Amino acid sequence: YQPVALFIGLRYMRGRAADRFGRFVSWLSTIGITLGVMALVTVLSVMNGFERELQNNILGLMPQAILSSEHGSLNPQQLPETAVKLDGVNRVAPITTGDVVLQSARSVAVGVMLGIDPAQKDPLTPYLVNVKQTDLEPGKYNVILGEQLASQLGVNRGDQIRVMVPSASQFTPMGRIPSQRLFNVIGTFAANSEVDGYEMLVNIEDASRLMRYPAGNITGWRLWLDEPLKVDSLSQQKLPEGSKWQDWRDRKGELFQAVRMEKNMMGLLLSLIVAVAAFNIITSLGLMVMEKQGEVAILQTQGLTPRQIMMVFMVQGASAGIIGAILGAALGALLASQLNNLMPIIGVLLDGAALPVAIEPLQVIVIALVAMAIALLSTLYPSWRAAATQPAEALR
Amino acid sequence: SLLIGLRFSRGRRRGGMVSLISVISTIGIALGVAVLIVGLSAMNGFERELNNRILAVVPHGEIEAVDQPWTNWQEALDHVQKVPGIAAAAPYINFTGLVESGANLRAIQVKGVNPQQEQRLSALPSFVQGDAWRNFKAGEQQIIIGKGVADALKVKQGDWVSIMIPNSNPEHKLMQPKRVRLHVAGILQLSGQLDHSFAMIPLADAQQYLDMGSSVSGIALKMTDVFNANKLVRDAGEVTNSYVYIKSWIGTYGYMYRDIQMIRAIMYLAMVLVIGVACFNIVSTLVMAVKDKSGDIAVLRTLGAKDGLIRAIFVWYGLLAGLFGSLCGVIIGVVVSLQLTPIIEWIEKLIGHQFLSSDIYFIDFLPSELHWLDVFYVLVTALLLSLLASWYPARRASNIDPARVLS
Amino acid sequence: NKILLQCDNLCKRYQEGSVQTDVLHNVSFSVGEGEMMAIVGSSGSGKSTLLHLLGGLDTPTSGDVIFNGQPMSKLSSAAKAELRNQKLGFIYQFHHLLPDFTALENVAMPLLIGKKKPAEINSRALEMLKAVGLDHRANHRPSELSGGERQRVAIARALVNNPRLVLADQPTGNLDARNADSIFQLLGELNRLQGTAFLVVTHDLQLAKRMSRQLEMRDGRLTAELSLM
Amino acid sequence: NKILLQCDNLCKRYQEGSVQTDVLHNVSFSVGEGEMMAIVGSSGSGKSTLLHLLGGLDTPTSGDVIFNGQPMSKLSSAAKAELRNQKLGFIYQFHHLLPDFTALENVAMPLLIGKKKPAEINSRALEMLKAVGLDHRANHRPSELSGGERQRVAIARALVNNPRLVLADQPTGNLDARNADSIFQLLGELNRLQGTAFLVVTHDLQLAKRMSRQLEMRDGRLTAELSLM
C-alpha cells in the first residue's frame, strides 16, 4: 500500500502469474528489450574487441603515420619530435622507410626496411633473441632478419645478404648500378606475426649513411597514433613547409583501410537495423499498455488523475526497461562467449577459436540507459490516449 | 460452409477503432522482413565485392610446385583442374624484380600471363575499357604502360621502350640480361591501380631470362569457393611429390576470414532476434486480445471434422496478417536496397543533431545486390513464423478449460 | 428416472491440502428429459461452479457428471464439441459475448459453427431474437448493448441450436419483471414443445416457484427437495 | 433541498450518420442531501447510460449536469478526479473490478488514491467488508470471486469513501434476497447517519418500494414521479 501510486504498477508487473505460462507472455515486454540490448551489446563488444585486435597485432609492428620532406632532403630542426604537434598523436620516433631488394645464397626477393634508433622502445627488441638488443650499432652494418623471409630464402645466421636500394643509382655502360651493400645477419627476429615476411629492422644511422644523405638527415618521423578512425579527417593538419603527410590508409596497406571502411559502414547498417527492431519491440509494450483499457478506465473512475496514470504506466515501462537492460548487460558480459565457447562443433560452421570480445563499460552503460529512456518514453502517447477517453469502457 | 465459414471469424478480428492493435502485427512482420532483406542483400554484396578483392585479382593460395626446369606439368594440370571445386587452372609466371624507367629503378611483380590462355582462362581483356582483339595478340610483345613511367617517359603510339632484365639469377655471371623492346599498343583512362602494381611480360623473354628452357613458375587457380579451398588445395597437392611439403597460407588473410565469420554470425544472431520479436508481438496480440473469444467458441464448438477449428481460425488470422506484412515489407526492402533516395539530405534535415545535411553522407557507398532466392526464403520463414506464433497460443487457449474465461 | 443427467459424488475443492475450500461436495443430480429445475441459494453457495462442472466447462476434482449415459470427463474433444453444439446451450452469469460480432451473428454463431445452411441460419437467428425481444437491436455489437439486452442475446444463443440441456447462470439478474416473465414463458414453451430441459440458477424466489423442481444450494449441499404429486 | 445533482436537458445521440440511435431526451434530475432515490425501467430504456453520463464518466451531447453548482462538462480533469475520489461513489452495472488486486485492495483503492494513512485504510476496508459480508472473502482475487461477491466488492468500493452521492447500476442484480436486504439496510443506515444520498437503478419492485423516491426511466423520458407525503 505504498502511497506513491507505483503500487498498482508493481502489482501489474508481478501479477497474473496464473498457469506458469501467462507470466512468460506478461514478461515478454521486457524479454524483447533484454534481447535487443543483448544484441546491441554483443555487436558493439565484438566489433570493439576485433578492432582493438586489428589495431594492435597488425598495426603496432608497421609504421602508423609518417612525416617527411616535401622538397629535397628532410631537415630535422624544421619540426623535431618534441615539436611534433598533431591531433591524436601518441608516440613519436624517427625512422627511415625504404623499399629494398635482398639477395641471398638461394634467390632474390624484395621487401621494406625500417631504420630506427635502438635506444627507444623498439617493438621488436622482445622479438630479438639469440642476439643483442641493440646489435645494429651505427656503422656495425648489422641487420636483423625475420622468420618467414629467412625460411623462404633458406638463409641462416652468419651469412652475407646483398641489400640494395633502387633510389640511389649511377650510370654505367653495362646497365644501372644502384646502392648495394653486403650485410651480415647474426640470428633471427621471430616476430611471430604476419608482417615479418617482408619487413626488416635496421639501424637509422647506417640507413642514413646508405642513401648518401647529409649529416643528421633522416627519411621521416614515425607517429604511432591512438585511433584509426580519424585518419581520413586528419590529413589536412598543421604540416609546415618541408614536410608532407603519409599513412597506411592509401599509400601502403590500403586493403586493410578499405575493408575497415566497408566493415564500419555495414556495422552501422546492422546497428540501425537492430535499433529499428528495438523500436518495433517497444511498440509491443506500447500496445501492452493499450491492452489495459478496462483497468485504466476503472482507476480513472476511482478519481485517479490522468497525469497519475501517466506516471503509473511510465513507471511500469521504466521498470521493464531497467530489468531488460540489466539482463541484457548480464547476458552480453557473462554470456558473450564465456559458456563452452557456444559449442562450435555443431554443423553450423561456428569458429570458437576467434573470440575478439572486449566489453566496453561506457558503451554498455549508454546502450542500457537509452533502452531504459525509450522504454519509459514510449508510454507517453499510449497513456495520454488511454486517459483521454472518458470511462466509456463498455468493452469498446 | 467449407471455404467461407472459417475465415469469417479470423476476418472479424478488426473491431471498432481497435484495429490499430493488429496493425502492429502487420507492421511487425513488414519491418522484420524488410530489415532481413536489407541485411541479407547487404551481406551478399559484401561477399561478392570481397571475392572480387581476394580471388578475382591476385589469386592467393596455391601449391607452389618448386622445381628445376619443370616440364611434365601437363599430367598434374589435367588431373587437378577437373577435380570438384576448381573452376579453372592456368599457368602464369609469378616473378619479382626491378624494372628500368628514366634512369630509375622500380620494384615490381612480373606477371608473365599467357597470351594464348589470356582470352580463355583469364579476365584481362574483359576488364579493359574495350579494344580490338588483335591489339592483345602475341608475338609482337606489347606490354601495358604505367603512370609511374609514362609521367617522365612521354611515350605515345610508335615509341619503343627498352626494358632490362633484373638479372636476379643464381649465376654470378650477367648472362646477357634480357633486353625487351616493348611497344605502346594502347592507352587506358580508368585508374592507375592497374598501372602501378601489375605488369605483363611475354613468355619468350620470361623463359630466356630464367637461364633455362620452358620453366613454368606457377599454375594459378580461379575458383568459386574459399572456405573449403584449404583442404581442397591440400588434397590437390597430395597427388604431388611427398618429399616436398606445403606450408599453410591461412595466416595471410585469416583475419579477413574471421571478419567474414564475425559479420555472418552477428547478422544471424541479430536477425533470429528480429524473428523472435515478430513471434513475440504475434503471441502477445493473440494471447490477450482474443482469448475469451476462443473460450466461448470452444464452449459452442463445431462437429469435429478437424479438432483445431479454433486453431484453423487463428491459422487464417496469422496467415493473413503475416502475408500482408510480408508483402509490404518485401516491397519496402527491395525498394530501399535497390537504390537509395536521389537526395538523401532532403529527408534527413530533422536528423536531430541540429547539423546541416549529414557529416557522414555517402554517395554510391554501402553496395548491395539482391538475391530473390533469399527473398523467397525470408517470405517462407516469415509465413511459417506467423503460422506458428498464431497456432501455439491457439493451442494453449483451446485445451485449457472454458472456465478460464473469467480469469 | 435419471436419464439426461446423472451427476454423482461431484466434489470440487479448489487449491491444495490443508487449505482446500469445500465449494462443492457430494452433489447428486437426477435430471430427466424436459425436467424443469431451478437452483436457488445465497452467496458463494457454489451455483455458478456447479453449472460450469455440469457443462463440462471445468474439471471436477472428484465425482463424475454423466450426460446421456456417456461421461463428460472421459469423453473426447470432438464429441465434447458435438454435445456443446447440439445438446448443451450455456448462458453464463455474465454476457461473455463476442465483441467483434453483432448480436445477430452472436446468436447465429452456434449455427454458423454447426455447419448449417446460411439462409436457415439467418432466418432462425432472427426468429430467436424476435422471440427474445431484440427486433430493433439485432445488428448492434455487444459494445453497443446494455447488460439486460446482452443477457437476452446470451439466452437466445443458448436456445438457437435447439439444445436438449440449457444450463443458465442467472439469466434474469440484469432484467426487469416483464422481461423475466417473458423469458420464463419462452422457457416453459420450449419445455412444452421442444422438450428441452432447462437447468437454471436464479435468486428470485417467485420465478423459481413458477417452475416444477427446486433445489437449494447451501454449504455446498443440496437441501430443499419439494415434490407435490 | 435539491442541491447535490441538478441535471437538465441531458441528451445523448453519438453514432454513425442516419443510424444514430437516441437513448435520452431532455432528462432532468434534482437530487439533494440524503435523498434516497431509485430509478426503475425496462431493459434498454436508458438507465445505465444515464448514470454513466451524469457521473461524468461519459460526455453528454447536450444539456448540463451540475454537481454542487459546478458543471462537470466545463470542469478540468484534476477537479473531476477530486470529485470522483471524494464525493462520487460509482457502482458499475457489471463487476468492473481490477483483476490484479485482491478483494481488500480492490475495496481500498479509493482510500489509497486519497493519500490516506494505511493503518486506518486497512481498518476501514475491513469494516466495509464485514458490513457487506465479505470479511472472509478479502483474500480472493476477482478471478476467484463470484458474480454476487464481485457486486458486493463493487458496492463496498463505492461506500468506503463515504461519498455524498453514490450512483448504483443494478447493485443487487446478481444477489439473492438476504444479501439484497442486508445491502439496502446498510444503504439506509449510511443515508441516515453519514448523510449520503443514493441514486440506485434497480428492477426489483419491493426494493424500489423500500426507496424514498421512485422515478421510471423509459424511452428517454421520465414517466413516473410519485410523492407520498
Ligand SMILES: Nc1ncnc2c1ncn2[C@@H]1O[C@H](COP(=O)(O)OP(=O)(O)NP(=O)(O)O)[C@@H](O)[C@H]1O
Ligand atoms: N454508444 C452508445 N451509448 C449509449 N447507449 C447506446 C449506445 N449504442 C447503443 N445504445 C443503446 O441504447 C441503450 C442505452 O441504454 P442502457 O442504459 O444501456 O440500457 P439499460 O438501462 O442498461 N438496460 P438494463 O441493462 O436493464 O439496465 C442500450 O440498450 C443500447 O442498445
Ligand SMILES: Nc1ncnc2c1ncn2[C@@H]1O[C@H](COP(=O)(O)OP(=O)(O)NP(=O)(O)O)[C@@H](O)[C@H]1O
Ligand atoms: N478458483 C477459486 N479459488 C478460490 N475461490 C473460489 C474459486 N472458485 C470459486 N471460488 C469461491 O467459491 C464460491 C463459488 O460459488 P459461486 O456459485 O460462484 O457463487 P455464486 O452463487 O455464483 N455468486 P452469487 O450467486 O451472485 O452470490 C465463491 O465464494 C467464490 O469466491
Ligand SMILES: [Mg+2]
Ligand atoms: Mg443497464
Ligand SMILES: [Mg+2]
Ligand atoms: Mg452466483
